[PDB]
Symmetry: C5
Amino acid sequence: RAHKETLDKLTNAAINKINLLNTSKVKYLVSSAFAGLYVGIGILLIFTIGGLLTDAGSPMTKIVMGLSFAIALSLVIMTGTELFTGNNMVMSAGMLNKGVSIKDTSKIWAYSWVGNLIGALVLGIIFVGTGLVDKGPVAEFFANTAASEASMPFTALFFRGILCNILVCVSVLCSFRTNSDTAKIIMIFLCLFAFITSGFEHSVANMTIYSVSLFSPTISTVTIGGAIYNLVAVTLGNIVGGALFMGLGTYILGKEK
Amino acid sequence: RAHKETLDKLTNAAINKINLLNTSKVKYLVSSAFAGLYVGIGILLIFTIGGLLTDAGSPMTKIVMGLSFAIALSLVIMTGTELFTGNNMVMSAGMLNKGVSIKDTSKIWAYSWVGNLIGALVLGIIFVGTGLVDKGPVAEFFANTAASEASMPFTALFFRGILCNILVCVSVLCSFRTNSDTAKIIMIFLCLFAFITSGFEHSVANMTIYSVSLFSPTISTVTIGGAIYNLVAVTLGNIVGGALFMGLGTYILGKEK
Amino acid sequence: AHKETLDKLTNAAINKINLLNTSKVKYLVSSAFAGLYVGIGILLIFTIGGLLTDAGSPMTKIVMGLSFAIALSLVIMTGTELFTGNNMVMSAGMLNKGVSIKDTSKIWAYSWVGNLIGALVLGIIFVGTGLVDKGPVAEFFANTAASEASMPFTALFFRGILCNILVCVSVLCSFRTNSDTAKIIMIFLCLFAFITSGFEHSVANMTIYSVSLFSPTISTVTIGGAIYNLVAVTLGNIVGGALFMGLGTYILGKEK
Amino acid sequence: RAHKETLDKLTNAAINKINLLNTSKVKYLVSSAFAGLYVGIGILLIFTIGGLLTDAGSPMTKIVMGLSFAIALSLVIMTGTELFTGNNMVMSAGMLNKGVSIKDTSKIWAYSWVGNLIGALVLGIIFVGTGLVDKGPVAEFFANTAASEASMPFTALFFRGILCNILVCVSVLCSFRTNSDTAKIIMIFLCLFAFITSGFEHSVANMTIYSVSLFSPTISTVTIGGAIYNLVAVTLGNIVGGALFMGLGTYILGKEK
Amino acid sequence: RAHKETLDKLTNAAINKINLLNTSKVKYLVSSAFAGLYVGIGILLIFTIGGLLTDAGSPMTKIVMGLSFAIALSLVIMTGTELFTGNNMVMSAGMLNKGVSIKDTSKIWAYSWVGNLIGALVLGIIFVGTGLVDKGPVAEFFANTAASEASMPFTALFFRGILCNILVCVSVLCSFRTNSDTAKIIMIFLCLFAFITSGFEHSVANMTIYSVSLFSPTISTVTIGGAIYNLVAVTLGNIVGGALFMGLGTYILGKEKLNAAAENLY
Ligand SMILES: CCCCCCCCO[C@@H]1O[C@H](CO)[C@@H](O)[C@H](O)[C@H]1O
Ligand SMILES: CCCCCCCCO[C@@H]1O[C@H](CO)[C@@H](O)[C@H](O)[C@H]1O
Ligand SMILES: CCCCCCCCO[C@@H]1O[C@H](CO)[C@@H](O)[C@H](O)[C@H]1O
Ligand SMILES: CCCCCCCCO[C@@H]1O[C@H](CO)[C@@H](O)[C@H](O)[C@H]1O
C-alpha cells in the first residue's frame, strides 16, 4: 500500500500528457499513432492465430489468442506511447486530484483516440498490402469477427468494454506501482490474457479489426457504419471502466483527506 | 532465515491495516471491493476456460485452469488491495505478536470479507451484462460448478478451505520475504496453480462464482441458502488455514522468546 | 566463488544447530512446514498424474515434472528446514569444521522427523477434503504408493542418490545467486529433471505414504512397505547430498 | 516518458557505429558476420521445427516457429553485434538528429548488410556440412520455403518487409529504454513471435534461408536470381519500416523543438 | 559495446583456470567431474523424454527435448564448474590476448575433458544402478541413439560439433556480458533448445550417452571403438566452433587496435 504516491504519479502523468499536447500536437499525435499501431500489431498476430486454429477446429483457439496478445500493451508501456484506453484512468484520477481540468481530459481523450485510430489506419493499409488477407483463413477470420462485432447488441458491447478497460487500466496501474520492467510485462501478459480469452472488448484493438476489414478488397462483410457502431459502444464502455472504476477508485485510495 | 524480520513485517502490516480502517471506512471498503473484483476476474477467465475445455472433453481442463488463475492474487499484491484470505495470516500473526488486538482482527476480517463480497457482486452484475453467460458452455460451467459447490459436505468444504488458504497465505508470506516483484508473481502463480488444480476452495473466489450464478437468469441450479452454506464452510476453513497454520506458524518461527 | 560458497554453507550449518539447541519447538515447526510444503507439490502432481494417466496421455510424467517446482520453491522462499537439503549443508559445514558429526546426525534426525510430522498433518487434512475418496486421483496415489513399496532396494537407493544431487544442487545454486527469480528457475529445472527422470525424494514420499495410509480407500501398501521405501530412499538421498554435494562443495571451496 | 533521452541514446549508438567502421573495417565486418550468423541460427531452429511439424500436418506449425525464433535477435542484442535491420532505425534517427551524415548511414547500411550476408554464407556452408539437409522433411522445408519466397509478388514482399522491421526495430527500441536484460529478451521474444507467426519478412533471416538452399546439393527450384529478387524487395521494405517509421518516429518523439 | 571489457573478463577467466589447475589438480578435476555430471543430468532427462515420446509416436519429441535441456549448462554456469566446451572459447581468447600460453590452453583442455569424462562415468554407473534402463523405451532410446551416433560419418559429426559449440560458447559469452542471473539462464535455455532441436553435437553430453551404454547390461552393440570415434570427431568440431569462431571472434571484437604494439587490424 502506497496509494497516495501512486495517485501522485497518476496525477503527474496526466499533467505531463496535457502539457505535451499543448506543447506539440505533432508529437502527441505521433505518439498516439504509434500506440494504435502497436496495439494493432497484437491483433494481426492473434487474428492470424485465430485463422490458423479456427480452420483446424481447435478448442484452444481463444486461449492461445489470449496468451499471445501481450505484445499489444507491452509495446505501449515499454515505448512510452499514448494509448486512449489507459488515458481513461490516468486523466480521471488526475482531474479528480485537481492536477488537470475536465477540458484537459476531454482534449487528451479526443486526440489520443484519433491518433490511435490514425495508427490503426496506417497499419491496416500496410497489412492489406502484404497480400496476407487476400483469401483464406486469416481473411475469413477478420471478415467473420468484424461482422459479429458490428452486429452484437449495444448492452453486450458496452459491458464488455467496461471489463476490458478495468483489465487494461489495472495493468497500467501495476506499471506505476513497480520498478521492475519484467514485472510490468508479466502483469500486462496476465491482464491481456484474461481480457481477450474472457471475451471483453478494447476500442483501440477494434480499430485495427475494422481498418483491415474495410481496406481489404476481398473482405466484404462489414461497412464503415458497422465499425462506428461497434467503436462507439466499446469506447463508451472502456471509458466507464477506466474512469469510473479505475480512475475514481485509485483517487479514493490515494487521496489524503 | 529472517523469521523475526518476517514477523516484524507481518506485525507492521497488521497495524497498518487496522489504522487504515479506523481512519477511513470508505478507503478500506473500496480497497476490499477492488480485491474481491480482481480475484473474481481470475474466476471469469478460468471458468471461461472451464467452459471451453469441458465442452471439448479435454483432460487438460483443470490443469489449464490452475495455470491461468495467477492473475487473481497477482493483481491483489501488485495493487496493494485488501483481501480477506490474506488477512487471516497477517492479522493473526500481528495479534499473537501484540501489535493489534483480537477486536482489531475480527474487525479487519469482517470488513475485508464484506468489502470483497461487494467487489464480487459488482463484477457479477457487469459480467452478466456482457451477455457472456446467456447460454452456452460458459454459462453451463458456472451453473454446474455452483451446484456441485453447494451440495458438497461441510467437512469436505472446510478441509478444502484450510489447504487453499495455506497456499494463498504462503504466497503472501513469500511476498513479505523477497524484494523482487517478479519472484512474488511467480510464487503466486505456483501457489494458485497448486490450489486450483488440486481442488481447494477459496471463499472470496466463490463469491464471484455465486454472484454470477445469482445474477444470470440462465443459471438456475443453485440457491441463496446453498451459496451461504458453501461460503460459511469455506470461509471457516480459510480462517483455520490462514490463522491457525500460517499465522501461528510464522509467529512461532519469528518470536524472540 | 567456491571459498565464499563454502563459508555460506558452513554458516548455514552453524545456524541450524544453534537453532535446534535454542528451541526444539521452533526447529520442529520449521521442519513440519517444509515437510508440508514439499507434500503440497505431491498433491498437485499426483492430481495431475491421476487426470492424465486416466486419459492415457504420453505427457503425464513430463507435465508432473514441470509442475513440481512449488515443492522446493516454497521451502527456499520461506526459509524452512528440509531434511534433504540438510544432507549437503551439514556435511559441508562438518568437513569445514563449523559443526560436528554429532550436530549433523542430530539435525538430520530432527529435520527428518519434523518433515514427517508436516507430511502426516498434510495427509490427514488432504484426506479430509474428500478428494481421494474415489476416482483417478485416489487411484494414482494408491497405485504409486504400491509400486514404490515393491521396488528393489538397490533401485530405490540409486534413485535417491540422483534425486538429492538435484535437490541439493538447486539449494547450492540458491547460495550462489542473489536473484530470487534465478533461484526459483534453477529449482524449477532441477525438480523437473528429478521428477521426470524417475528419481526419489524421501520427504516427498512421506506425503505419498501419509495420504495412502490415511485414505480408507483400498491399496496394496502397508506400513511395512512404506517404511521400507522411506529407509532405502533416505539412505540414497543422504549419499547424494553428503557424499557428492557436501564433500564436493567442501573440496571446491576449502583453502588448503 | 523519456523520449529525448532515448533519441540521445540512438544518436550516440549511430555515432559509435560509424566511428567503429572508420576505425576498423575488420572489426565492423566481423561483428556484422556474427550477427548474420546469430540470426541464421534462429532460422536453422525454426526451419527444423517447420520441417518436423509440417511433415506431421500440425496446425500449430507457424505458431511454434514464432515462439521459437527469439534466439535470433536475443543473441544479437546480448552480444552487442551489428545487425543491418536494427541499423535502419538507429542510423536514421541519428542522422535526423544530426549526429551522423547521410553518407555515414549508407556506409553503415552497406557494410552491415554485406557483413550480415557473410555470416549467413558461413553458417549455410557449415550447416550443409552437418548433413542435416541431405534429405527429409527439414531439407524439403528449406527447399519449398526458399522457392515460395522467391516467387512472391514484389509488393507483397515489400509490405511484409515494412511490418517485419517495425517489429525488429521496436524490439531494439525497447532495449534502449530498459536497463533490465530480462525485459529486453522478453520484448524480443514477443516481437519475433509476432513477426514470424504473422508472416512478415526479414532480409537478414532470408540470407540464411538462401545460403542453405543454394549451398545444399539437394535440389530446389530457387536460383541465385530468385534469391536476389527476394532479398532486394525485402531489404527495401525493411529500410522503410526501420527508417521511415521507427527512425523518423523516434526522432519526432525525442527532438527538442 | 562493450567488447574490450568482455575480452578482459574472458582473459581473466582463462588466467584463473590455469592458476587453479596449477594450484590443485584435485580441485580442478572435481570441478570438471561436477560439470560432466551436470551436463549428463540434462541427457538423462531429455533421453527419458525421448523414450517416452518416441514410443508414443509424437512429432514434438525433438522440440520437447530441446526445450528441456537447459538444465545442463544452467547448472554448469550457476555452480561455477569447469566445462571443456566452454573452455574452448575462454582459453583461446585469453591465449590470443596473451594472458595464458598455448601450453596452458592444451593443459586446461586436456584436464577439463578428462575431468568431464569422469563425471559422466560416475553418472552413468549410478543411473544404470537405478534400474531405469534395464528395459523399455528409455533403455531403447539410449541404446539406439548410441548406436546411430557411433556410425555417423566423421564430417557430419565434425560440422555438428562446430555449430553446437558456437551455441554453447555464445551462451557462455552472454553470461560474461550480463549481470542478471535470470538473463544468463534464459540465454542458456535458448541456445540449448537451438542446438538440441537442430541436431548439433556436444562432446561432453555424448560422454554420458556412451557411459550409460558402457554400463547398461541390456546390450551395447555400439563398441568402445565406435564411442571413441564419435567422441573424437565431435570434440574436434567443438574445438573449432569454440576456439576458431568464438574465441578468435571475441578477441577481434575486443582487442583495442592501438597495439599495433604488435599487430594491425584495418
Ligand atoms: C490528424 C489530425 C488529428 C486532429 C484531431 C483533433 C481532435 C479534436 O478533438 C476535440 O478537441 C477539443 C480540444 O481542442 C475538445 O474540446 C473536443 O472535445 C474534441 O472533440
Ligand atoms: C456495507 C457496510 C459494511 C459494514 C460491515 C461492518 C460489520 C461489522 O461486523 C462486526 O464488527 C465488529 C467490530 O466493529 C466485530 O467485533 C464483529 O465480530 C463483527 O461481526
Ligand atoms: C516430536 C519429537 C521428535 C524428537 C526427535 C529426536 C531425535 C533425536 O535423534 C538423535 O539425537 C541425538 C542428540 O539428541 C543424536 O546424538 C543422535 O545422532 C540422533 O539420532
Ligand atoms: C568483404 C565485404 C566488403 C564489403 C564492403 C562494402 C563497401 C560499401 O561501401 C559503401 O557502399 C555504399 C552503397 O553500397 C555507398 O553508398 C557508400 O558510399 C560506400 O562507402
